[PDB]
Structures are given as C-alpha cells and as structure tokens.
DNA sequence: GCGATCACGTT
DNA sequence: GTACGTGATCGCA
C-alpha cells in the first residue's frame, strides 16, 4: 500500500525541523562528482520529497544542512558528504548514520542498502535499491513518480529503524563505538577522499613505456624458450605449454588445471630456463595492467589526482578497505614495483608527503591482550621481536640466531597472529607438516600466554558466539560449532585473529580522528591522504614537516593505552616513494 | 554483457 | 593460515 508524501515544488519550514531522517541520493557506484537524483526528508512533520535543483539552490535548505544543530539521520552519510562537497556544500548534524550502525551490529550481513540493514528488524515496507535501480547495463534511475517513492520509503525505514539500531548497539556497548569513533571517522574520510591524492602521470606514462619495452623482450624470449606462441597470460595455455610440451613435473594442482602460481613456479625454475622469463614477465605484466594502465585510468584529467572510495563498513574485522583505485596495495616490497610510489606527490608546490606506520602492532596487540610475560617484555625492551622468537624457539643466543632461523621465526610470528596452522605454516615455509608442527609447540613453549590466549578465545567464542576487539567491535562465528573439521577449524583461526587485528584496526581509526583534533588546534595546514591498516599517510608544507615529526607519532602512540607500549616509524619525502 | 577462475598486489 | 580489490582469460549467452 503505497505510502504518502509531498512531492515539494518548494522548500518549506516544516521541512527543515531540528530532527529528521535525510535520504541525499547518488545512484552512481563511485560518487565523486556524481549527481544526486533526488531527496527525501521525513521528520514530525511528515514525508517531502524535494527535486535536487531545487533544494540544492535554496539558501534555507543549504543552511539547514550546514547546521550541526539541525541533527539527520542517514544511511551512508560519506556518499552523501562528498557528493555534496563537490558541489560546493557542506553536510553537517548526521548523528546516526544506519550503514554503519548495521555494520557494527554484524559485519557479516553484508548489508549494503537499506533494505538489507531494515530486514535485520523486521522492516520490509522499503525495496531494495537494486529492485528500483536495476543493475549493470541495465541499471538506471526510475521516473519521478517512482524515484519519489522509494526515497521516501528508504527515509521513512531510517526514521523507524534508529531506536531499535542505538538500542541493540547499547546493549552490545557499542554506543560509544558508532557515536565516537565509526561516525566521526566517516567524516575524516569524506575529506580524504574529497581532497585526493596527486599523481605525476607523466612519470607514470614513462615507467609504462619502459615496461613495455622490456616485457616484449620477455615475451619473446619466452617463445623461444617453448619453441612457439601462445598466450603467456592463460593460466590453462600455459599449463599446456609447460606440464607437456616441456614436460616440467606437476608439483601441484588447482582444481580445472595445473596450477602455474608463482609459488609453484619458483620451485620449477631449476628444471627449465623459460619459469624464470614466466616469472619475470608475470612481475612486469601485473604493474603493467594493475598499477601503470589502472592507474591512469582512473585520475581525473582536469586535477590529475585519484579520489579513492574507502569502505568503511565491509570487512569482517573493522578494517578499511579501499576502491577506484585501491591505494592500500600500492607495490613497496619489490624495487621495481616501488617505483610505482615515485607517481604520487604532494597536491601543492612546496609541499612534501609525511608518512607514519605503527611498527609490529599487531604483535603488541596481541602481547597485550594475552599478557604473555616473555613477549611483553620482549616489546618492553624494544627487542627485534623475530629474533628474540629465533632465540626462544631454536634455545640459542642472539649472536646464534642465523638468517635463516629468523626468517621461520618471522613466518611463525605471522602464522600466530593469522590463526596459527601446523599445515598453514607448512606449506608457508616448504617444510614437512610435522616439523611445523613442532616449531609451533616450541612457540607455546615459550610464550605461554599465547598459547592460554589461544585456547581461551576459542573456547570464548563458543560460548558466547562472539569476539570482541578492544573498542567492543564484535564478530560472530556460528562455524565454531560445525562438525565439519575444516569450515569449524576456519571459525577457530578467525577467532584467534579478529581480536588481533581488530584491534588493531580499532586504533589506528582512533589515532585518525585524535590526528585531525591535533592538526586542527594547532591550525596546521597538513592533511591525512590515506591509511593503510597500519599507517597513515599526510601532505603539508615543508614548513610543518619538523612539526610533524614529534606530533604525527606522539598522537598514534597515544591513541590507546596497552601493557607494551606503540610504536611509530616516520619519514616524509618529495614523493610517496620517498617518504622512507 | 556476466560471472567463475586464475593470478597477485597490500597488511 | 588473516583481511582485502583488480585484471586477463574463458565458458555462455
Ligand atoms: O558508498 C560506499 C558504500 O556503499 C556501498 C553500498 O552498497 O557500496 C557501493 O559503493 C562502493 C564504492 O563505490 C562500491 O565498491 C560497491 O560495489 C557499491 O555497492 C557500501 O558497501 C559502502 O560502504
Ligand atoms: O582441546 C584441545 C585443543 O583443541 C582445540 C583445537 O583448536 O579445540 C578442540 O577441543 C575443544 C575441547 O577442549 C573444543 O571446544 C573445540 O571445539 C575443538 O576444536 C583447542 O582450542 C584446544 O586447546
Ligand atoms: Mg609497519
């Protein structure tokens, strides 16, 4: 039974209460300079539903959503903020944004529209925005009559839905967790994703010119080595080339094929000359397509910078994720990928890119949550944590620990921090499953309050159904009763993770919105870029750099109080490159 | 035009 | 063994 509302030709009084729920819709994927099709107030008053020209252009209107008194109600508030600011107009008063009180509520929804986040408390009086919009080439905004209607009815839901969302969110003590970190991060994104990164396109266009050239060299001499040509890049035509013609041993397959992984590959590089070219030519061809072409196709052409869309309620721990482009995996291990950082630089002449990075955090965290003696100290000491792992596992001392003791000390310590696996491990460091299994009790040996924690969270997590991160992020795992061997063994590993890196995530996020207060008070021009998981990245003038560098690592330090103390590594260069 | 696979980049 | 996003190929319209 359809649902009534003023189709407002006009902006009204009435329209602009202290309280209400505001639907500002962009149907556009990626927002930035998007148009927004349409709005939808509900409030005491009633339901309106205004064209955008129209209230767009009314100074009332305008005001009204610049007011911090006059409090909304949103779902997807980011979407809408910078929507807004590219068109010259500032949002504020959102004080309950229903996507993110969803995502907090339970991650694994996956609730990516109202509907979904509605159907969560028996509302189903709204359509999802696929059903209205349709998807793919065949998506597309509906008549007014029609858009009219679901904006109202998505406006109508949030109205509803914001009790029950804070009450259930209350008695899970996540009040706090949405109100003051998940929402007024929302907003730090906003001007992140808004101001946009620099990139000297230029340099890109030159590195792909050279990658190119050699990757053909690659490519060719690839055909030589097969004694033919075939389509290096298909997975099923090169298992052709290289498990027959060559007749190279199959040391492992996927599930359609033989898998041609660079894993796999390194370990038949001794067998013929042409793995080696594979590997090189998988290397080149990857920044290539990904980074070099990707890139490139995404900055705008009139600025030169690239707007990124992070996602702030997708993954299962608390994370970020980032999108269009994804700058959180922007190549730094490998040299040559690298240089891919060199095309990111300051948005303004003068100034210089700052970067900061939590080291280990991870592992701190987990030292704190386990209160593992040997390992807190070991932090307490600012010990080369892989080393003193070497030491411990292997019984010897430090000046024993050879490279390669600490390199499968340091594969342990990721392994530990992921959900530590005998097979896991195994297959991570080429070894018997055994002989993993017996580098792990020798960890427990050694730090047995990791081992405590470990058995203790998986245990927590079958009665309760739950983990829960330092700021009270929750994750559920009803896996960790299946009977299944493997999918439960899957809900123990998360178990033993989610908190680690959880909480991790939980105050990096902290350490952002404590930043910006920072940089404010002290009126500083610098800004936040990016994060990735565990570092933050700044530009500001050269001027503020030696500022920066005391204030920058004081407030990530500071974020949260932990038994170990947080450790931050900085440096700050002409480009991202250089901000090593 | 789409979606399941494959691969590989980050933490 | 965590947690992600993107690109080339290929089976099917
Ligand atoms: O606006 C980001 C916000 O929107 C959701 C809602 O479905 O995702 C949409 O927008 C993303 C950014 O363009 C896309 O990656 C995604 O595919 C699209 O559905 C939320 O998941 C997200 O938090
Ligand atoms: O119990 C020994 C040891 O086994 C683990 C393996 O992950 O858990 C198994 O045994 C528990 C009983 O103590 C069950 O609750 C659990 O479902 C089963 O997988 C460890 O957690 C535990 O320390
Ligand atoms: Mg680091």
Same mark, same amino acid.
């Given at each position: 039974?359809?649902?009534?509302?003023?189709?407002?030709?006009?902006?009204?009084?009435?329209?602009?209460?202290?309280?209400?729920?505001?639907?500002?819709?962009?149907?556009?994927?990626?927002?930035?300079?998007?148009?927004?099709?349409?709005?939808?107030?509900?409030?005491?008053?009633?339901?309106?539903?205004?064209?955008?020209?129209?209230?767009?252009?009314?100074?009332?209107?305008?005001?009204?959503?610049?007011?911090?008194?006059?409090?909304?109600?949103?779902?997807?508030?980011?979407?809408?903020?910078?929507?807004?600011?590219?068109?010259?107009?500032?949002?504020?008063?959102?004080?309950?944004?229903?996507?993110?009180?969803?995502?907090?509520?339970?991650?694994?929804?996956?609730?990516?529209?109202?509907?979904?986040?509605?159907?969560?408390?028996?509302?189903?009086?709204?359509?999802?925005?696929?059903?209205?919009?349709?998807?793919?080439? $065949? %998506?597309?905004?509906?008549?007014?009559?029609? =858009? *009219? +209607?679901? @904006?109202?009815?998505?406006?109508?839901? &949030?109205? !509803? /839905?914001?009790?029950?969302?804070?009450?259930?969110?209350?008695?899970?003590?996540?009040?706090?967790?949405?109100?003051?970190?998940?929402?007024?991060?929302?907003?730090?994104?906003?001007?992140?994703?808004?101001?946009?990164?620099?990139?000297?396109? $230029? %340099?890109?266009?030159?590195?792909?010119?050279? =990658? *190119? +050239?050699? @990757?053909?060299?690659?490519?060719?001499? &690839?055909? !030589? /080595?097969?004694?033919?040509?075939?389509?290096?890049?298909?997975?099923?035509?090169?298992?052709?080339?290289?498990?027959?013609?060559?007749?190279?041993?199959?040391?492992?397959?996927?599930?359609?094929?033989?898998?041609?992984?660079?894993?796999?590959?390194?370990?038949?590089?001794?067998?013929?000359?042409?793995?080696?070219?594979? @590997?090189?030519?998988?290397?080149?061809?990857?920044?290539?397509?990904?980074?070099?072409?990707?890139?490139?196709?995404?900055?705008?052409?009139?600025?030169?910078?690239?707007?990124?869309?992070?996602?702030?309620?997708?993954?299962?721990?608390?994370?970020?994720?980032?999108?269009?482009?994804?700058?959180?995996?922007?190549?730094?291990?490998?040299?040559?990928?690298?240089?891919?950082?060199?095309?990111?630089?300051?948005?303004?002449?003068?100034?210089?890119?700052?970067?900061?990075?939590?080291?280990?955090?991870?592992?701190?965290?987990?030292?704190?949550?386990?209160?593992?003696?040997?390992?807190?100290?070991?932090?307490?000491?600012?010990?080369?944590?892989?080393?003193?792992?070497?030491?411990?596992?292997?019984?010897?001392?430090?000046?024993?620990?050879?490279?390669?003791?600490?390199?499968?000390?340091?594969?342990?310590?990721?392994?530990?921090?992921?959900?530590?696996?005998?097979?896991?491990?195994?297959?991570?460091?080429?070894?018997?499953?055994?002989?993993?299994?017996?580098?792990?009790?020798?960890?427990?040996?050694?730090?047995?309050?990791?081992?405590?924690?470990?058995?203790?969270?998986?245990?927590?997590?079958?009665?309760?159904?739950?983990?829960?991160?330092?700021?009270?992020?929750?994750?559920?795992?009803?896996?960790?009763?299946?009977?299944?061997?493997?999918?439960?063994?899957?809900?123990?590993?998360?178990?033993?993770?989610?908190?680690?890196?959880?909480?991790?995530?939980?105050?990096?996020?902290?350490?952002?919105?404590?930043?910006?207060?920072?940089?404010?008070?002290?009126?500083?021009?610098?800004?936040?870029?990016?994060?990735?998981?565990?570092?933050?990245?700044?530009?500001?003038?050269?001027?503020?750099?030696?500022?920066?560098?005391?204030?920058?690592?004081?407030?990530?330090?500071?974020?949260?109080?932990?038994?170990?103390?947080?450790?931050?590594?900085?440096?700050?260069?002409?480009?991202?490159?250089?901000?090593?």
């Amino acid at each position: 039974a359809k649902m009534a509302f003023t189709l407002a030709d006009r902006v009204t009084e009435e329209m602009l209460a202290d309280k209400a729920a505001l639907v500002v819709e962009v149907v556009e994927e990626n927002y930035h300079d998007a148009p927004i099709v349409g709005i939808a107030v509900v409030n005491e008053h009633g339901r309106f539903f205004l064209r955008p020209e129209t209230a767009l252009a009314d100074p009332q209107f305008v005001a009204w959503l610049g007011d911090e008194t006059k409090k909304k109600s949103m779902f997807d508030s980011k979407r809408a903020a910078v929507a807004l600011k590219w068109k010259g107009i500032e949002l504020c008063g959102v004080s309950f944004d229903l996507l993110l009180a969803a995502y907090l509520l339970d991650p694994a929804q996956g609730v990516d529209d109202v509907a979904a986040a509605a159907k969560m408390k028996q509302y189903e009086a709204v359509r999802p925005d696929e059903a209205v919009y349709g998807k793919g080439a $065949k %998506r597309a905004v509906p008549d007014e009559p029609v =858009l *009219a +209607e679901h @904006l109202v009815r998505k406006a109508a839901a &949030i109205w !509803e /839905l914001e009790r029950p969302f804070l009450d259930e969110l209350r008695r899970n003590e996540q009040d706090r967790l949405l109100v003051e970190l998940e929402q007024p991060l929302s907003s730090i994104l906003a001007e992140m994703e808004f101001a946009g990164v620099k990139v000297d396109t $230029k %340099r890109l266009e030159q590195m792909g010119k050279e =990658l *190119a +050239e050699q @990757l053909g060299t690659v490519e060719q001499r &690839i055909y !030589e /080595l097969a004694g033919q040509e075939f389509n290096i890049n298909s997975p099923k035509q090169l298992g052709v080339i290289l498990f027959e013609k060559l007749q190279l041993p199959v040391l492992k397959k996927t599930k359609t094929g033989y898998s041609t992984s660079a894993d796999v590959l390194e370990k038949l590089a001794p067998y013929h000359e042409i793995v080696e070219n594979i @590997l090189h030519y998988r290397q080149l061809g990857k920044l290539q397509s990904t980074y070099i072409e990707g890139l490139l196709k995404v900055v705008r052409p009139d600025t030169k910078k690239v707007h990124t869309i992070f996602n702030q309620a997708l993954t299962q721990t608390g994370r970020l994720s980032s999108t269009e482009p994804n700058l959180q995996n922007i190549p730094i291990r490998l040299e040559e990928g690298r240089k891919i950082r060199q095309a990111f630089v300051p948005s303004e002449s003068d100034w210089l890119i700052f970067a900061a990075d939590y080291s280990q955090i991870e592992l701190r965290v987990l030292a704190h949550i386990a209160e593992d003696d040997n390992l807190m100290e070991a932090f307490r000491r600012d010990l080369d944590i892989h080393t003193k792992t070497a030491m411990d596992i292997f019984q010897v001392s430090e000046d024993e620990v050879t490279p390669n003791m600490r390199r499968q000390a340091k594969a342990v310590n990721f392994g530990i921090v992921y959900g530590i696996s005998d097979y896991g491990l195994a297959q991570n460091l080429n070894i018997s499953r055994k002989e993993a299994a017996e580098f792990i009790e020798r960890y427990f040996e050694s730090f047995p309050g990791v081992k405590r924690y470990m058995e203790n969270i998986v245990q927590e997590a079958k009665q309760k159904g739950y983990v829960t991160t330092l700021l009270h992020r929750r994750r559920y795992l009803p896996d960790i009763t299946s009977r299944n061997f493997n999918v439960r063994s899957f809900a123990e590993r998360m178990a033993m993770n989610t908190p680690i890196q959880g909480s991790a995530a939980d105050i990096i996020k902290k350490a952002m919105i404590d930043l910006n207060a920072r940089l404010k008070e002290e009126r500083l021009q610098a800004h936040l870029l990016l994060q990735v998981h565990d570092e933050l990245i700044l530009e500001a003038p050269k001027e503020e750099m030696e500022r920066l560098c005391r204030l920058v690592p004081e407030v990530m330090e500071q974020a949260v109080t932990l038994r170990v103390p947080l450790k931050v590594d900085y440096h700050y260069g002409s480009t991202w490159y250089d901000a090593k």
